[PDB]
Design a protein around this nucleic acid. Structure first.
Lengths: 204, 204, 1169, 353
DNA sequence: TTGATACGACTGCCGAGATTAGATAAAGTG
DNA sequence: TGACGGCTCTAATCT
DNA sequence: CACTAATAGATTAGAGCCGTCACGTATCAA
């Protein structure tokens, strides 16, 4: 839902009214209150809007900003984009791929553990593994949830062993350039079992 | 129409009728009107009803409850479409289904083109207006389809894309969001609380 | 609007017979200019009895044969000739057959022919053929063959009637068929016999066949497509071409709807260019062998004597002889590999574009063949050879055309039978066949020079200069194909395209006066209207104007602004701004609308835009169709919410159909729903009528029925259609009803007749102007067909009019390479002028009645407001509502002047660079080209800044007859210095806005050159200025390069011959005269190189170039030569480096003093001696 | 059917029907190509054609039966008995993959075949009627055709040509004698200079021809000055053309066998109409001239059966007034010689009665 | 003066209508 | 036999 | 010239796929 809401704000062919946008930015001006470059970029964008025709698609504003030097990769323009995303009805760039305290892309980026109710009192435990790098515009595959079921011991087994499993899961040799969903000794076990299968067709 | 089927079989299909027709008597079928308070007698858990409401939905933005006879909701547009050297139209949809443990499954279903009706196999017809596949029980004008993908290359639907809103709407997360928002809007009365994915807290 | 003005205009045009001037007249459509010109033309033709006129229009219904006959009856003197005898309509073959059969059915045929059994049988056969041709048309097509069958049957019928005519006229026809070559005198007997016959049968014969006596015809009415095509004489079996016919001499062709003829002419030219193809290799070899055949005294007396009489013939012989050796064209080309896509190579005047992949490339002696393959190995340069062969072919064809005209005039003055003689298509074909070429070769080589020439030798006070290159060289594209018929060689199928519509008009203007009529005749666009700039440049005084021959009262009446203002007929425009929803297309003031109905409307709209027919990966964006639907429904809502909106005319560019793009049923259902939803009490009696070609009834029938529904029905209607359906004219006026008579405004001036139809009707109360369709052809993929050629010709037209730079052209060509269409040009005045022309033609049909609604409303999308313009078109000579629309479009504007000037500058630089590359390729072959290059460079140096008059008056400009390198920039502020930023220095592209490279005397080092003692006196001696006097024209960077080169050349010559006190003899041997600069004692070579900025990148490339030139020189002279390159000015420390190539960093510094006298003198003296 | 009801020239309708049938034919290829282990959709007329034919020979059981019964020309080389009417036997056939119809009389299929001629007495009128239409349909100017051939023949001697074809020509000495004969008689009859005019002439009130230097051409109006017996000019050119065409036919046969032998394939290449036409196109000759030369050439006793009829007809046209086209109609293939050629390709039977 | 860590990676346009003449060009029988 | 790992078609299982 | 005839689903279980192993750019620490 939040991804839809933000991409609606960043929609390219979204028509805008010059007078309405100018008035909205003027009213939002007091809320900026940042560093020198941030406020300077905000005022430059505010003064840029008046240049174009009374109505324009958001692509025209984006191209005008890019030509005027408001490259989204810059540190000042990024804060303006974030401010517009949080408070304005439009934004030149969306803060989706950015790492934010509460991102809508949560769970697809890091290793964490969850506690799903799954009914009454079972307290089923799961964990996920996400890509360490910043997410690319497209993500082909989802990230499955493994299950942590204590066969022996109390419920603290998970709470005391999960950091070790996560430490084993942050390795590069098992999976090329990514985390490994399972601990790395599973790779050793899989290779060792394949070595046996090479000599024992009874188990192939 | 949804499919009640369990290991302890007391039914095989559920029919949601605005006006109940004259119930006939056919050998080999047991048809009997039931009440939702006695819905436990046939192992009808509060999940095939959400399946019915899902089956009434459509992929298009700002849609309503349109009646449908297909047991499963299969969503496919014009983007997920390709032709072979025989001009065999081959769509691939996104099957949406809520399982017995209230988990949504978004598996990809691929459909191939067949010229003539097959009275022994299931025949599918693409409802272009609603942007979703439909079951065909009698010969109908149009082009028929059947499940399967025998060509070399597979068909993958992107999980989610953040290029823009249009590209977002043609992914698993985007299509699921479109359907969920539609269902939460048109069937406002039918659900006491809206359909939202279960929220959980990351621990470690 | 009076007949006297048009008669005086015709008299003025006829008074300019020796020059054949061209007349253009732009007047509004609502004046009946066609009727007035018909009356005036008929009066003049009746009065003079020696004057010819071709009334040429586009569509058949605009011929107005009945108007011509009624005008002839009205003003046909007091002793008169039959109208059918003087003024006749030249119909097409189909139409002629249709009329003949229809006359046979109602028995209009005279008893002389109907009583003939043989003619009855022939006519029955013709009817049987037409009943098939009809069906063929309606069915399997490939109608070319069908047409040949119909032509043969019609010729059989004509043979039957001429046979019976000769039988009744006591004329004996001499007789695997009889030679129906009736003697000129027999034709005379037939003509006088039908003259002596009763009026009815002679009238019928003249009406059904105008070609019976075409010489006696005075006014000929025929369509544009037929006029540019051929016609069949009544007696002769084959068909003569109007363009070459002697009947066009001293004629007056009238082009009704003058601007609309260019599309038809261009499409016909493209079709004929694609129809003719030939193998380049064979054609060239056979032509060269024929050119050798004439120069051995083997041809007859007439051709051989005239051909050898000129030196140009020997020059062409040498060109062909050296070209054959250069590219080894005596052998055959065999692309051995089976290409997955052979593709085609197009040669635009800008670049040599290849369809796919790596460009084609070597002689292979051991197999004794040329490969023509896609491998890195290439010796004989192919991409060079195709243009090189094309240019030689064009020159040879021009020469042959000149000699053919000489031979034609010779044989024509020789013969005594004037009535039927050689008409110059015959002479060219005869000469080509005498050379030894086939019919296809003759056609392809005759469609190259066609007829454009300098008219033998006719000196005139005007000079026709034009910098546009597409209209001088054209585009030629080649195809490679190999077939099991010819496994040994690979055919290079070449199709050319030279006859642009402007070129065709100029060729026509060489033999007949042209008068043009149109509402937008003088609109400056190169897409729909002729290239007015090119025509003006090539004509001069011959391009007259029409406004000088109209009464002032007509001009005053054209205004209509004062009348509208006085009677308080206010025009209000409403813009439509929608994104995806229905909520903003509905009135916000009301609230009775329940959100459920709006939600349902949005849902059906989403379904309909989902119904869009799959494209070839163009990716349906359900958004554009949603915008167009919402704009149409906003127009619907505005129409429904206004009781005074009696009549309305929606004008999209799509005729509603069954698909989801425009759905008739969906539109009707939405209109009904919106009526029930928002009408309430204002649109309780509205109705929508869609007029289109889909309906069986005619467009006029449906329009009349809807307007009747308005007038006598009592209900307001909405008419929806496309721009192309409702043609110019087709007035939409309806008889006034009681409510509409209760409130209106009679714009009629005081004193008009009360009993007048125009005062008893009303015009439309509002129009909706949808988005305009394809202006620049949008087509994918760029195949070798009519659509692709039309698109590339459109782009070339835009480039010549200085509206797109080479950057956009290259980007668009690359887009065609990958089959992905690009963005339309942002700053192209022709595009917006065409857009405004379409909207003006749409709006011109709302001011054709004296009574008007007190509030005319106009609704259109925002992009329509943005794309409209005012440049080129006079505001006073347009509809008042268009004036209001322009006034309301002041916010949405795109400036032309600055970007257009920048693009013109870049195009001038690119064209100069291309000219110099071309002359460098042809540098050592011809002597005239070397002289032109030398004179042009010396004029470059002598005149760094020149005035317009001083540039035109120059001898090089006068003699070149076109802008060859002499295309200076336009110095607006008379600046002596300007700065440009180079981009791709090897392609002549320069962004004039950006800085980074100086073009000035200081930049060329001329001041440092001045600081050397003695260089001043030499420069003033050679008339070379020491500083740039301010002037209105300045050099371009491509010109500045050669300016620098020659300046360095002369300065280095002087400095080296003064400091060293030795004489450097310039290379006086032609081929090496333009290869290297100077030599001395026959063993050393001196080549100075002045280049200041000098990107140091890949100096070893410069070494390879100078060593290759040195090796070529040594191979020429069989001697040891040593090259000493010298830079005249250097900002770096001096440092000679040896190798036989010698090197000198610099000679003079910015102070004009020698750099390293001792070491440099020692090294040069030691090595040189 | 509607067109047939119209009683019209069946050429246009036949072309449309042929296009429609070619569409479904191509549909069959595009269905079979991806099915078999191939693609690339000439469909690899040397490789994937064999793969298609092999695939349709092993997996199909009943579909192969329908394909063979419906389209016998799909794989003709493996067909044993070819029952067909004489009209189709002399009017070519349309191969499955290719669009252009190959002629029966030249197809490698007819190599070493046994051709039973049922009702053989009736295979005379059909052959004669087809030959006379073929002769009347294909016309060319004798003067231009001869000089064009000599230039192409002179091209061989003077290097040029792709060599692959050049060798055979330099060998087999008679190549130089035909050329020196050409060069010798070109000067004698001045065919280098363009003829000039100021009725048919059959061969088994007359015309003459001088050579007015002033005009630099030759006249042929009747005022006998230097009549070289133009009536003997015609047969010399005719016999030279005959001999040269036989020589070119032999070289085309050699180039044919060479090309087919290096490109081992499934009996489908260079039907020896393509070979001679390629030879003539390399020699710089037009399509019509190549057709006339091949028609004259395919000839490898009474007077008719020895040299046949050769009718010539002068003409004039305003399109070309400085020259006169000596249009030549040639007939040398009598039905007996057609039978003899069919006897060289294959052997006949005599079931006639 | 370079070795980190957080985020950029941009696709175009969007039909109807009207006018011509243009060698050709196979192989059939219910 | 780059290999991990989601997941897609498809044969299998199950009335 | 010719056809009639008259036809398991639904849900898991697994082999084997593709496709992702991030890259060129502004930017704060050390």
């Amino acid at each position: 839902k939040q991804i839809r809401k933000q991409l609606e704000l960043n929609r390219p062919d979204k028509t805008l009214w010059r007078d309405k946008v100018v008035e909205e930015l003027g009213e939002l001006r007091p809320m900026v209150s940042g560093d020198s470059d941030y406020v300077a970029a905000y005022e430059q964008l505010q003064a840029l809007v008046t240049g174009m025709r009374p109505s324009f698609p958001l692509k025209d504003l984006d191209e005008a900003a890019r030509k005027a030097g408001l490259n989204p990769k810059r540190r000042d323009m990024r804060q303006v984009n974030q401010f517009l995303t949080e408070n304005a009805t439009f934004t030149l760039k969306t803060t989706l791929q950015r790492e934010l305290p509460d991102s809508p892309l949560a769970g697809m980026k890091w290793i964490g553990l969850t506690r799903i109710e799954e009914g009454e009192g079972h307290f089923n435990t799961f964990y996920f593994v996400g890509s360490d790098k910043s997410l690319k515009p497209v993500v082909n595959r989802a990230v499955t949830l493994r299950r942590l079921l204590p066969l022996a011991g109390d419920a603290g087994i998970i709470d005391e062993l999960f950091p070790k499993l996560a430490a084993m899961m942050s390795v590069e040799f098992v999976r090329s350039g990514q985390y490994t969903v399972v601990p790395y000794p599973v790779k050793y076990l899989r290779e060792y079992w394949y070595s046996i299968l090479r000599q024992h067709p009874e188990y192939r | 129409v949804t499919s009640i089927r369990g290991r302890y079989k007391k039914g095989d299909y559920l029919m949601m009728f605005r006006q109940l027709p004259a119930i006939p008597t056919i050998a080999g079928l047991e048809l009997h009107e039931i009440l939702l308070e006695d819905m436990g007698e046939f192992k009808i858990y509060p999940n095939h009803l959400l399946q019915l409401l899902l089956n009434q939905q459509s992929a298009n933005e700002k849609s309503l409850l349109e009646p449908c006879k297909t047991p499963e909701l299969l969503i496919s547009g014009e983007e997920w479409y390709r032709e072979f050297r025989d001009m065999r139209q081959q769509y691939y949809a996104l099957k949406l289904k809520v399982n017995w443990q209230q988990d949504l499954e978004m598996s990809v279903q691929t459909f191939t083109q067949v010229t003539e009706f097959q009275w022994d196999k299931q025949i599918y017809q693409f409802d272009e207006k609603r942007g979703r596949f439909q079951l065909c029980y009698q010969p109908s004008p149009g082009i028929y389809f059947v499940q399967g993908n025998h060509s070399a290359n597979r068909n993958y639907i992107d999980f989610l894309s953040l290029q823009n809103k249009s590209s977002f709407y043609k992914s698993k997360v985007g299509v699921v969001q479109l359907v969920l928002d539609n269902l939460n809007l048109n069937a406002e009365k039918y659900l006491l609380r809206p359909v939202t994915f279960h929220k959980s807290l990351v621990e470690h | 609007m009076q007949v006297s003005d048009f008669s005086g205009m015709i008299k003025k045009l006829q008074s300019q017979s020796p020059e054949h001037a061209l007349m253009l007249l732009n007047a509004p459509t609502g004046t009946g200019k066609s009727y007035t010109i018909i009356r005036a033309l008929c009066r003049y033709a009746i009065k003079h009895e020696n004057f010819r006129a071709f009334f040429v229009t586009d569509q058949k219904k605009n011929l107005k044969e009945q108007d011509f006959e009624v005008a002839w009856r009205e003003e046909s003197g007091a002793v008169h000739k039959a109208f059918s005898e003087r003024v006749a309509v030249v119909r097409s073959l189909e139409d002629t057959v249709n009329k003949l059969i229809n006359d046979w059915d109602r028995q209009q045929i005279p008893d002389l022919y109907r009583s003939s059994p043989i003619f009855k049988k022939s006519l029955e056969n013709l009817g049987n053929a037409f009943k098939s041709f009809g069906m063929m048309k309606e069915n399997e097509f490939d109608l070319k063959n069908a047409w040949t069958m119909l032509s043969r049957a019609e010729y059989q019928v004509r043979r039957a009637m001429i046979t019976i005519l000769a039988d009744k006229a006591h004329v004996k026809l001499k007789n695997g068929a009889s030679a129906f070559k009736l003697d000129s005198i027999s034709k005379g007997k037939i003509r006088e016999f039908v003259s002596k016959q009763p009026k009815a049968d002679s009238k019928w014969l003249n009406e059904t066949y105008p070609t019976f006596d075409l010489e006696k015809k005075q006014i000929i009415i025929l369509t544009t497509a037929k006029f540019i095509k051929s016609y069949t004489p009544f007696f002769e079996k084959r068909s003569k071409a109007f363009r070459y016919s002697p009947i066009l001499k001293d004629a007056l062709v009238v082009l009704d709807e003058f601007d609309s003829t260019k599309k038809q002419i261009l499409e016909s030219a493209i079709d004929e260019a694609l129809k003719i193809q030939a193998d380049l290799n064979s054609l060239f070899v056979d032509l060269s062998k024929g050119l050798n055949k004439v120069n051995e005294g083997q041809l007859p007396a007439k051709l051989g004597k005239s051909f050898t009489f000129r030196d140009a013939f020997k020059e062409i012989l040498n060109d062909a002889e050296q070209l054959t050796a250069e590219f080894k064209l005596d052998f055959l080309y065999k692309m051995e590999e089976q290409g997955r896509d052979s593709g085609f190579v197009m040669r635009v005047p800008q670049t040599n574009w290849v369809s796919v992949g790596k460009p084609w490339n070597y002689f292979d002696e051991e197999l004794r063949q040329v490969v023509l393959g896609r491998q890195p190995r290439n010796d004989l340069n192919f991409q060079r050879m195709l243009p090189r062969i094309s240019v030689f072919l064009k020159g040879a064809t021009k020469f042959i055309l000149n000699r053919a005209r000489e031979y034609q005039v010779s044989e024509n003055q020789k013969l005594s039978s004037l009535d039927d003689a050689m008409t110059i298509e015959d002479a060219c074909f005869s000469i080509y066949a005498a050379l030894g070429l086939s019919k296809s070769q003759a056609k392809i080589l005759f469609s190259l020079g066609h007829d454009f020439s300098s008219p033998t030798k006719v000196k005139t006070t005007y000079h026709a200069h034009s910098g546009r290159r597409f209209q001088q060289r054209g585009l030629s594209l080649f195809q490679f194909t190999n077939d099991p018929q010819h496994d040994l060689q690979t055919k290079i199928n070449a199709c050319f395209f030279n006859e642009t519509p402007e070129r065709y008009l100029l060729n026509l203007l060489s033999k007949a006066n042209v008068l043009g009529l149109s509402a937008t005749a003088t609109l400056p666009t190169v897409l729909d209207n002729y290239d007015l700039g090119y025509l003006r440049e090539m004509l001069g005084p011959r391009l007259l104007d029409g406004v000088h021959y109209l009464s002032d009262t007509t001009i005053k009446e054209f205004d209509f602004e004062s009348r509208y203002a006085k009677q308080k007929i206010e025009v209000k425009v409403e813009t439509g701004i929608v994104d995806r929803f229905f909520s903003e297309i509905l009135p916000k003031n009301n609230q009775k609308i329940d959100n459920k109905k709006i939600w349902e409307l949005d849902a059906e709209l989403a379904k309909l835009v989902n119904c869009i027919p799959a494209s070839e990966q163009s990716r349906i964006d359900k958004k554009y169709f949603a915008r167009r639907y919402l704009n149409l429904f906003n127009s619907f809502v505005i129409f429904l919410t206004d009781p005074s909106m009696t009549s309305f005319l929606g004008l999209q560019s799509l005729l509603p159909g069954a698909d989801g793009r425009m759905d008739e049923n969906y539109i009707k259902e939405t209109f009904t729903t919106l009526k029930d939803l928002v009408g309430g009490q204002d649109g309780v009696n509205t109705e929508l009528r869609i007029v289109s070609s889909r309906n069986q009834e005619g467009i006029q029938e449906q329009l009349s029925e809807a307007l009747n529904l308005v007038s006598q029905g009592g209900k307001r209607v909405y008419i929806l259609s496309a721009y192309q359906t409702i043609g110019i004219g087709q007035n939409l006026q309806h008889e006034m009803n009681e409510f509409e008579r209760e409130q209106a405004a009679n714009i009629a001036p005081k004193g008009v007749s009360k009993s007048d139809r125009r005062q008893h009707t009303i015009d439309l109360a509002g129009m909706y102007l949808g988005e305009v369709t394809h202006i620049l052809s949008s087509n994918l993929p760029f195949r070798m067909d009519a659509a692709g050629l039309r698109s590339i010709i459109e782009q070339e037209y835009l480039f010549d009019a200085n509206e797109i730079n080479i950057k956009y052209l290259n980007k668009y060509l690359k887009g065609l390479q990958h089959q992905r269409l690009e963005r339309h040009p942002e700053y192209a005045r022709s595009l917006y002028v065409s857009y405004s022309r379409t909207i003006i033609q749409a709006l011109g049909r709302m001011n054709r009645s004296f009574n008007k609604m007190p509030l005319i409303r106009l609704v259109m999308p925002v992009n329509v407001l943005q794309m409209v313009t005012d440049s080129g078109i006079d505001v006073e000579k347009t509809s008042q509502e268009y004036r209001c629309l322009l006034t309301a479009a002041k916010d949405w504007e795109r400036d032309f002047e600055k970007p257009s000037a920048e693009i013109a500058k870049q195009n001038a630089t690119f064209n100069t660079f291309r000219d110099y590359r071309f002359v460098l390729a042809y540098l050592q072959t011809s002597k005239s080209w070397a002289q032109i290059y030398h004179d042009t460079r010396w004029f470059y140096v002598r005149h760094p800044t020149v005035s317009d008059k001083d540039l035109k008056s120059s001898q090089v400009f006068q003699q070149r007859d076109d802008e060859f390198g002499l295309q200076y920039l336009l110095n607006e502020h008379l600046d002596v210095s300007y700065e440009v930023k180079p981009i791709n220095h090897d392609n002549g592209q320069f962004d004039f806005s950006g800085t980074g490279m100086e073009v000035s005397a200081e930049a060329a080092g001329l001041v440092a050159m001045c600081r050397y003692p003695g260089l001043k006196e030499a420069f003033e001696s050679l008339d070379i200025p020491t500083k740039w006097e301010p002037n209105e024209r300045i050099l371009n960077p491509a010109q500045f390069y050669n300016y620098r080169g020659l300046l360095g050349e002369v300065s280095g010559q002087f400095i080296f011959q003064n400091e060293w006190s030795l004489k450097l003899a310039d290379f006086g041997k032609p081929e090496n005269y333009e290869l290297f600069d100077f030599h001395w004692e026959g063993k050393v070579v001196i080549d100075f190189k002045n280049w200041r900025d000098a990107p140091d990148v890949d100096t070893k490339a410069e070494r390879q170039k100078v060593e290759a030139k040195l090796a070529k020189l040594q191979a020429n002279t069989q001697r040891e030569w040593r090259v000493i390159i010298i830079n005249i000015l250097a900002s770096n420390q001096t440092r000679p480096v040896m190798t036989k190539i010698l090197e000198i960093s610099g000679l003079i510094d910015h102070q004009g003093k020698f750099l390293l006298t001792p070491e440099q003198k020692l090294n040069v003296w030691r090595f040189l001696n | 059917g509607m067109m047939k009801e119209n009683e019209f020239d069946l050429k246009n309708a036949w072309t449309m029907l042929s296009r429609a049938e070619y569409q479904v034919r191509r549909a069959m290829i595009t269905i079979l190509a991806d099915k078999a282990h191939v693609k690339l959709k000439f469909k690899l007329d040397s490789i994937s054609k064999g793969k298609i034919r092999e695939f349709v020979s092993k997996q199909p059981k009943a579909d192969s039966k329908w394909l063979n019964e419906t389209y016998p020309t799909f794989d003709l080389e493996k067909k044993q008995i070819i029952i067909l009417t004489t009209a189709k036997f002399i009017k070519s056939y349309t191969p499955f993959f290719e669009k252009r119809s190959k002629a029966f009389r030249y197809s490698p299929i007819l190599k070493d075949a046994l051709v039973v001629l049922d009702e053989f007495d009736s295979t005379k009128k059909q052959i004669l009627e087809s030959a006379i239409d073929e002769a009347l349909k294909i016309q060319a100017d004798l003067n231009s055709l001869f000089v064009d051939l000599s230039k192409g023949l002179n091209k061989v001697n003077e290097g040029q040509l792709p060599a692959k074809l050049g060798k055979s020509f330099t060998f087999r000495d008679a190549f130089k004698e035909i050329l020196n004969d050409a060069e010798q008689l070109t000067a004698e009859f001045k065919l280098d200079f363009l003829y000039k005019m100021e009725g048919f002439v059959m061969r088994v009130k007359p015309w003459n021809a001088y050579f007015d230097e002033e005009l630099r051409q030759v006249v042929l109006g009747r005022q006998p000055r230097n009549d070289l017996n133009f009536q003997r000019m015609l047969p010399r050119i005719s016999v030279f053309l005959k001999g040269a065409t036989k020589f070119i036919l032999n070289r085309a046969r050699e180039y044919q066998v060479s090309e087919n032998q290096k490109l081992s394939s499934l009996d489908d290449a260079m039907t020896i109409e393509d070979a001679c036409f390629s030879i003539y196109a390399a020699l710089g000759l037009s399509k019509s001239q190549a057709k006339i030369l091949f028609s004259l050439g395919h000839d490898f006793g009474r007077r008719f059966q020895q040299r046949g009829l050769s009718l010539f007809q002068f003409t004039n046209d305003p399109q070309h007034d400085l020259q006169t086209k000596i249009n030549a109609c040639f007939f040398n293939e009598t039905p007996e010689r057609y039978l003899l050629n069919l006897l060289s390709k294959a052997n006949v039977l005599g079931l006639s009665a």
